[PDB]
Design a protein around this ligand. Structure first.
Ligand code: HEM
Ligand code: HEM
Ligand SMILES: Cc1cc2nc3c(=O)[nH]c(=O)nc-3n(C[C@H](O)[C@H](O)[C@H](O)COP(=O)(O)O)c2cc1C
Ligand SMILES: Cc1cc2nc3c(=O)[nH]c(=O)nc-3n(C[C@H](O)[C@H](O)[C@H](O)COP(=O)(O)O)c2cc1C
Ligand SMILES: Cc1cc2nc3c(=O)[nH]c(=O)nc-3n(C[C@H](O)[C@H](O)[C@H](O)COP(=O)(O)O)c2cc1C
Ligand SMILES: Cc1cc2nc3c(=O)[nH]c(=O)nc-3n(C[C@H](O)[C@H](O)[C@H](O)COP(=O)(O)O)c2cc1C
Lengths: 405, 504, 405, 504
């Protein structure tokens, strides 16, 4: 914590003042509400990124370097946003990514409420479950209200492989439909908001408890290699997706060892700062795949900074099989539990359908590159420092004013 | 007053208050009863406002915001039940439409309205915007000023103009300049026009679209007026208010899913004398303007979600989402009026328009109220015109643009690129809202003067002389998104400071 | 005015608190002091630009799109910043440009104090005199303390040519050394700060007193043409410079009709808004001249937004014969009269010498293009609108804080 | 204590107070009298501070800011007059040097100093900066944090790093990583070093440069220390304070106009054991740091200007402005120590350095304290290294960079481009100012950890594996200057807002 007596007071009062879920307009509304009501600990843990949080923000910003070239006078009365992911039919082209410790924001239900929100309405959304979920995989998969809802397991390979061996067999038996092996966290990203929180709140055996090593964990084997993945292919039938690819070279390697897909991701900017926006790695990757007809050998997903239907649409047009979101659902789930998640799903689903009509296409398969203006995709810029004295003494024009009372 | 049959079984203040449910909605408007149940899902203004005022007397909401002809033209006769007997409980008759408007806002605003500066003191189009932002009801200001979703395109429409600079000619005789031109076969005094916008009555209750008509045709400088199919005034009263016979009026058309209504409407406006039809194609689905939505919510713990309708709520029979190129070809065969396709957002579709032979297109994204991340039309114009020429198609299609135009230099830049004319929406709504018809006229003078003055400094003397070589287009594509700012580095950094006066 | 009783009160008190001239560090200091002490009328008149004042600011900003490629290990003990302009030797590579109505900020002396500041110290700076100066040309030229100081006359050709005829003969007889004919003001730029001032302070014969025409004046003939300049060449011996060129095409025409030079200028951004930064037109112009050895046929000057020695140095390296400044001197002259002007001259002179040593060259002639990095000269950018909701709800990292008292 | 001849005609508190003029300046330092008249124009600290305290006892200003050896090494014996007799009027003996420091600032700051957070709670290098900004005297903070003129380059040094992104490798065994490397013939624990900075005593009065020496060599991780010719400590005490024999100390050299002093100094530091000589060439003239100047003015109508000296005031015999390439060639012949040219700002000069055969260069602009608009060294490095290879010259010259480095990822980016090592100045001055030697050590741990942690995520395990293919350099040249913001448009515009809580 580090949560005062009056901190708890103010927050329970704010949660009682949460607006009606019917009044939430977009995914940022959940984020705002969450920012005022979660404990300092849960907020820092969910909202933080690595170091200067540049990548975390760039993930979102890069989407804005892409504009649309919509078609008009196309019959868009009826549209469809369902598609297939990893051999299963899905109602939407997005999914809930794995996020550890959902109980920080939703103590009673944690990941269970996410499972429920994902399957309780007419729209069924796939849920990725973190190896580090605060609920057990059994209880999470059991809370899923529908048999038609997909659940994927995000796997962290343990240094003690036998634990992973047992884990993989357990989740497979439980029904998950795929394994997403996270490879962008061999060392823990440094999330300074958390750390600052812990210091303001106020070690006997050496060896691998000092400096950089403090960011290593036996839980997440830092020596995981391509060979290990090849091995994993032989020990399971579940489709395998490598989560955390950050360069085209590694997408090519994934195809070469024949896994089912990759997730171009930088862990929501929580790992290596200055890793590129996945939307940008995607734009570079897909064309290169086609130039080797790896076209369909590999399904390419992306996550990071997706907050609008139009963000999703851009990824789809570039060729992403699906688009993942982490924080928005966390916030929705933390403020309004399962219903919050359901509402988040509706908001994103309606955003995609609506803008799909304005783009002039009627199905996910019709989302193609020609629908995008990619001409300014590389305009990732850093301005020359502002001329302080010049702009400080300068006085800009002013608007006309009303007469004196 | 609607053409209701006053010879029908009168109805009672009790049998009405009954039907106040989404599937059995009855309402009273000026002593008459209507079954609006089948209607609401298509209400252009949203079903919610009708839903949450069902079974009640709604005249105070309805009357000041609608064209005199909507019940006639859009409600099925069978649905016009009959005369109401008496009144309605005082708590069952709705008050004026002013979502979130407090008694204190009304107070403060009527006072500010008395303090509006003299129209002679208005310098530029932003002044009207400022004044309007402080005096309109929250609802009117939201409805006029909102854009779709994050309002990026709305802003980008304007910003993109700043990616273009001028290459002016000096030592050219510019004593005399002329800014008149021709558009769609008619001579026009200026190269700009007032674009279609619905609900002009929100900011100008007494006159709405009619004062726009007056402002555009009363002075020495006349400007073309485009009339929205969804105007708050009828096309006959708008056209009749036109002070001059030489002023141009265009009709913006929304094709109905019921093509008979559109066929009748086209014949009607053509008989009324509009000079062209601008068919809007960028709104098959309603853009989400969150400022409005928020305002409507502020009124109206852990969960409630049940029968929330989807993306279908943004569809309406008033704007047929199935409109296609074939429909436009058919439209050409039913009218002698020049046809312009309004809402083109890519060169491919400007080519298709040339191919089916319509008169022109408006490169537009509806003022950024529809698809967010649609490009600035000025940028689409830059790409389009050269491509037309690489096929002579230039002069085969008149290309207009709108969106974010606030300065005469913005107009000049579009003209140099080859636009036939430039449209403006919001600025005129603000001018009309604050100062009525004379506001519209003042706006016209401001923009006219801005175009002539800067035309002299550009070194040309007529619209036909505005060409691309007058522009520096080298940085037109420098539409950028910076790397996120380094928060810690910039927070702790202290910049240079100016010298200061000696202590008193 | 529009100057209250308490406005005058506050200002006379502020002027009495002006810091010692020895304490002025750079040209912005004069601007700040001037902004607090001049009358609203004088401040609006001097500080305003046309319309949205984009060009006025861009004039300065474009200099920052150029960096230096300085040479080290060069003997820079002794340096020299003198050069020649229009056939005369000058101590510095800059000059005071014409500015109308100097008496608004300096009521007692106006342009006379500029003449004095320009010639009273060891550094003699050329002064350009506005046809619309608030002092007569005779009194201004007479106030010049030195015979070695240069004075140029900025000419506005009158609709009544005979007046210009007489004017040209008069200034020539008085000793001015050149004629700078202003061609960027056939119509008056709209300076909204002025106008706003006049409206808050609260027409009988038609014809050419309405709308756009109100910006025309018989004083400044709007029908001036190249032919007229050709004529002017035949009626005077003084070198002729066309002031207000804004495109290379017109620099080429100047060479063709054989005038002495041009001033790439947009009137300090007071005329046509969105006219380019002269520094940028210069970078494009000089190479094109050489590709026609017009190399030395025409002397090319520039003004607009020059506030630092390094700004001057950039212009010189690109090939400008001299660099003009308007507002800074106005401010200096308005706050500290002639001494203010002298101090401004020292500040700019020392800035140029000092940075010249760091650039690794020792004379104006050694300032060349290879000293500049022009690779980002065209990075004049306009960002995509800021994502308001995303950045508003986002919370950036924070610095560590001191312990509680 | 200086080596003064205590056998000279004593002098009196009256014959001293006399010489208080710029051309007859006498001062007393620790009971001795000196004729500093010929000296002041060359005083590295500016002539003004000596001028305006002439004829007085200045020990309180002098003593805490200078190396123990400056009167010995830089004042002519003849100018060391003799012993003073008695004292000096209490109003003729200067107080500590604290320009603009009010009694209340001293109060507030000594209190904040007691409230400094535990060193274990410092997370990154910006924390030291923040803490230092609140606790140093105005003079010390200005002197450390200022840049030249508009401080653009100072900021650009840092900003340019953000124009580079990473292309990390995944699924690589990164259990073990090593960040040691070699620099100028010596093995180093890390790929970074503490760069030369004068006046470390400003922020650390008791230890200055000696605590830097300690911080750099006391822990398990040792870092190279570059010593300024203008350090506030003597080279012998700085080198003697070094806790470890394995720690590296480099000497930053400023060639004197009097080459005999330089010849002696080079021989002295070489005998003391420094491992290299970094000759600084980017300061022939003193950069103008306006924050300092302003501070000095705040103390000290229409005019006074008379004998104001010019650009010459920025020259000093301590830094020979006539240093040339030939001088460096000669220097090679007088020492066995590796020579590095510090302050190279363009590729042409890196080539010239290879040609004369020195050991390396530091691409640097002196932390943005010299020429404003000098480019970010990280950008010069990107251009330089490939060009070296297109001539094999790589490996012939070790290329270091400094300026604006605050994160391990900044270091990693320079290493991938081919830098042999990366220097930091300010961060260490702030760490040393707030927490002394342990602060320096903590800074070293912070940066070390940052390099190792991100190295693992980059997918490599040693310094030698840091290569260009690990970097995305596609936007390295996107150094931009936006069009001026449209003030009126953006002022009147109202952005989207977040939903809000229900009223209490
Ligand atoms: C008789 C049938 C009706 C027709 C044809 C009609 C048509 C329209 C149209 C064209 C608009 C403008 C849409 C736009 O902004 O583009 C509008 C707005 C509106 N209408 Fe109606 N309307 C009808 C009945 C009603 C009724 C019965 C109510 C009862 C409360 C109502 C309340 C409103 C309101 C409040 C708005 C403003 C909505 C907003 O933008 O916040 N209308 N209507
Ligand atoms: C005995 C001869 C002296 C030598 C060799 C000497 C040398 C230096 C050096 C190398 C610096 C650091 C310059 C830098 O920042 O790079 C300095 C700063 C300074 N010196 Fe001296 N100094 C001498 C005498 C004096 C005297 C007599 C005073 C008397 C008041 C004085 C006052 C200062 C002050 C105040 C500073 C700090 C200036 C600032 O940055 O604001 N020095 N000196
Ligand atoms: C609080 C939090 C916890 C996370 N935990 C995991 C995890 O345990 N395993 C994993 O593979 N990714 C994890 N992620 C990363 C997400 O799966 C995903 O890559 C990221 O959230 C996408 O970016 P976004 O938050 O902007 O949508 C986490 C992200 C957050 C914000
Ligand atoms: C409040 C408002 C209502 C509008 N209503 C309509 C309409 O009914 N039909 C139509 O074709 N366009 C409509 N438009 C779009 C305009 O015709 C035009 O595309 C746009 O306003 C140009 O952008 P601007 O407001 O930045 O000048 C509307 C725009 C606004 C701002
Ligand atoms: C208050 C003011 C008055 C001016 N008057 C004239 C004038 O009468 N004639 C002329 O040719 N230029 C005139 N100029 C423009 C200057 O000669 C010069 O082009 C401009 O000041 C350069 O830009 P700067 O102010 O940023 O240095 C004036 C500028 C200002 C600011
Ligand atoms: C307060 C201060 C004093 C400095 N003194 C010297 C010096 O005496 N000699 C030298 O070669 N460089 C000197 N430098 C420059 C540094 O060696 C180095 O180039 C610079 O600090 C790197 O930039 P950074 O501060 O952003 O890390 C100084 C820098 C600062 C900030």
């Amino acid at each position: 914590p580090g949560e005062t007596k009056e901190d708890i007071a103010r927050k329970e009062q704010l949660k009682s003042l949460l607006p009606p879920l019917d009044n939430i307009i977009n995914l940022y509304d959940f984020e705002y509400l969450a920012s005022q009501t979660l404990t300092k600990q849960a907020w820092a843990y969910y909202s933080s990124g690595a170091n200067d949080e540049v990548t975390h923000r760039e993930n979102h910003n890069a989407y804005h370097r892409i504009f649309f070239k919509p078609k008009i006078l196309v019959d868009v009365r009826k549209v469809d946003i369902s598609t297939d992911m990893l051999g299963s039919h899905v109602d939407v082209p997005f999914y809930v990514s794995a996020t550890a410790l959902c109980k920080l924001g939703n103590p009673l239900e944690g990941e269970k409420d996410v499972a429920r929100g994902c399957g309780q309405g007419v729209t069924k959304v796939p849920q990725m479950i973190s190896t580090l979920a605060s609920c057990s995989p059994e209880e999470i998969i059991e809370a899923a209200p529908s048999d038609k809802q997909i659940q994927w397991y995000q796997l962290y390979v343990n240094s003690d492989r036998k634990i992973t061996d047992d884990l993989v067999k357990n989740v497979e038996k439980l029904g998950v439909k795929a394994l997403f092996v996270t490879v962008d966290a061999p060392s823990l990203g440094q999330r300074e908001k958390d750390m600052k929180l812990k210091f303001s709140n106020t070690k006997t055996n050496v060896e691998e408890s000092q400096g950089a090593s403090r960011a290593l964990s036996k839980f997440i084997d830092p020596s995981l290699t391509w060979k290990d993945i090849e091995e994993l292919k032989k020990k399971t039938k579940l489709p395998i997706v490598i989560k955390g690819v950050q360069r085209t070279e590694d997408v090519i390697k994934a195809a070469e060892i024949g896994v089912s897909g990759v997730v171009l991701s930088n862990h929501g900017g929580r790992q290596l700062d200055f890793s590129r926006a996945p939307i940008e790695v995607l734009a570079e990757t897909m064309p290169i795949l086609e130039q080797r007809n790896l076209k369909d050998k590999l399904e390419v997903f992306v996550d990071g900074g997706v907050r609008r239907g139009t963000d999703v649409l851009k990824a789809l047009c570039l060729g992403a099989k699906g688009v993942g979101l982490g924080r928005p659902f966390l916030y929705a789930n933390s403020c309004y539990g399962r219903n919050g998640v359901e509402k988040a799903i509706e908001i994103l689903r309606d955003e995609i359908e609506m803008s799909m009509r304005l783009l002039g296409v009627t199905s996910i398969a019709e989302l193609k590159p020609d629908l995008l203006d990619l001409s300014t995709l590389k305009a990732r810029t850093v301005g020359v420092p502002n001329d302080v004295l010049y702009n400080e003494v300068y006085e800009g024009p002013t608007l006309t004013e009303f007469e004196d009372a």
